[PDB]
Ligand binder design. Structure first.
Ligand SMILES: Nc1ncnc2c1ncn2[C@@H]1O[C@H](COP(=O)(O)OP(=O)(O)NP(=O)(O)O)[C@@H](O)[C@H]1O
Ligand SMILES: [Mg+2]
Ligand SMILES: [Mg+2]
Length: 460
């Protein structure tokens, strides 16, 4: 009753190795995404480790591991690839969409280099929570369908339980796929990937009547829009290597990510990123640098001129999306030219006071235009900014009430803070999944107000 196609396998020969998952020892299902399963037509009986542990294949699957390469922290890293994951198959939905089923933690692969081919419970829990949180914030992302843990030791800085995440996404194409064949000097394979992407994900483009310029122009726009959305909610990816950039503009590969607590533009959550390359405030520039690396691979068959014109459009797209999202977050229903100074003055203040990002915006969503009605060392500077902020609000001539409702629909009450995830992980390792299930539920409603500790700052 589920329909898998062998599209990648049949259309992109020599981009993968066929092979099967390696099962863990005493694997067992600890969580699965019941809502998403209903959307994908997966019978609920399939969840009672089976395919979620890579111990069974469903009819139509033909598992392979993809090859790719990448720049890592700005330096060419050579061959990478699906070193600890496997594309089990591609499921076609009634929508006509296809959805990759990718098993992360599936065992050793020809692409594992010196890696064990395994993922650990804590990283699979964090990735499931992050990708579902992102999805309910309305930001493009891969999705999490299931987690299995095991009794199989996996050694990181300490011994951890081996685990696997069943990841679901429209595609796993990365900028690094193109880079891989470009630097191997196989420009034909580069173009094969472009044509495949256009055929299956930009089919409204008529074949070669400007298809390549228009497609890459959309690729830029989707990455700019993705970054704009991360910035707005205070998400720091932390490992924006070119192999972790999704061609479609999906958030891809959750590792040492971080949603901001205290507002700090130079926030680094990846403690291996010693130069702060992937600090929060560099994500706009880094994503442009990554697009330029992708643009490098297409110069054999796309005019270097059209490539730079598409690269040129990046900062206007990003600024359009960011500006429209911020105006909503500040409750600006119209657009006055006071807006950029009020913003710049807010972010300057928030930074000096180390204000919590999410909480500040959610509290600002209670503002009443005519009232002056506490978290700042310099209350003098706040009430002066708040004063000029509320005066500009009155210019909208819209009610206290509908501004508040607009803001509450774009400023979440809850984000996936590191200490909420940690708490679910600690409980999970002890065999209590209740916290994990409770937190996943809460993240399906980020814009709804809460009474519990899911909306508090971390305890310190
Ligand atoms: N434990 C591991 N064993 C084998 N390969 C690994 C391991 N950890 C990372 N790699 C590979 O090292 C490269 C960089 O890792 P990373 O960007 O973190 O990807 P990943 O989290 O393993 N998989 P993904 O979410 O598909 O991008 C990729 O080729 C990974 O497949
Ligand atoms: Mg990766
Ligand atoms: Mg990773």
């Amino acid at each position: 009753t589920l329909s898998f196609i062998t599209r990648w396998r049949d259309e992109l020969p020599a981009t993968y190795t066929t092979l099967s998952p390696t099962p863990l020892n005493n694997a067992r299902l600890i969580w699965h995404n019941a809502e998403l399963a209903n959307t994908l037509g997966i019978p609920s009986s399939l969840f009672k480790a089976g395919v979620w542990g890579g111990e069974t294949l469903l009819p139509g699957m033909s598992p392979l591991a993809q090859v790719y390469s990448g720049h890592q922290f700005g330096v060419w890293a050579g061959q990478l690839g699906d070193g600890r994951g496997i594309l089990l198959g591609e499921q076609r939905l009634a929508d006509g969409t296809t959805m990759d089923w990718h098993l992360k933690g599936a065992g050793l692969t020809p692409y594992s280099r010196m890696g064990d081919g395994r993922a650990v419970l804590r990283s699979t829990i964090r990735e499931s929570l992050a990708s579902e949180a992102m999805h309910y914030l309305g930001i493009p992302t891969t999705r999490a369908l299931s987690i299995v843990t095991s009794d199989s030791p996996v050694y990181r800085e300490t011994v951890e339980p081996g685990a696997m995440l069943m990841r679901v996404a429209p595609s796993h194409l990365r900028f690094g796929h193109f880079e891989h064949f470009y630097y191997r000097r196989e420009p034909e394979k580069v173009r094969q990937l472009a044509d495949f992407a256009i055929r299956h994900y930009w089919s409204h483009l008529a074949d070669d009547e400007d298809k390549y310029r228009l497609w890459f122009t959309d690729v830029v726009a989707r990455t700019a829009s993705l970054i704009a959305q991360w910035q707005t909610v205070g998400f720091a990816h932390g490992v924006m290597n070119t192999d972790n950039m999704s061609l479609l503009g999906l958030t891809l590969d959750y590792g040492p990510f971080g949603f901001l607590d205290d507002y700090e533009p130079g926030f680094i959550c990846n403690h291996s990123d010693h130069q702060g390359r992937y600090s929060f405030d560099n994500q706009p520039a880094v994503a442009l640098w990554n697009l330029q690396r992708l643009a490098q691979t297409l110069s054999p068959f796309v005019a270097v001129d059209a490539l730079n014109e598409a690269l040129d459009s990046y900062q206007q797209v990003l600024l359009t999306h960011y500006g429209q999202r911020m105006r909503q977050k500040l409750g600006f229903m119209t657009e006055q030219k006071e807006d950029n100074a009020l913003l710049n003055e807010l972010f300057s203040l928030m930074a000096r006071e180390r204000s919590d990002y999410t909480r500040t915006f959610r509290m600002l969503s209670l503002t009443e235009q005519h009232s002056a009605a506490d978290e700042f060392i310099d209350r003098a500077a706040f009430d002066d900014w708040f004063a000029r902020y509320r005066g500009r609000l009155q210019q909208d001539e819209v009610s206290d009430s509908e501004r508040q409702q607009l803001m509450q629909s774009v400023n979440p009450a809850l984000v996936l803070r590191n200490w909420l995830a940690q708490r679910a992980i600690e409980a999970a390792e002890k065999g209590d999944m209740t916290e994990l299930h409770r937190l996943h539920e809460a993240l399906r409603n980020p814009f709804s107000d809460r009474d519990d500790d899911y909306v508090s700052r971390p305890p310190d």
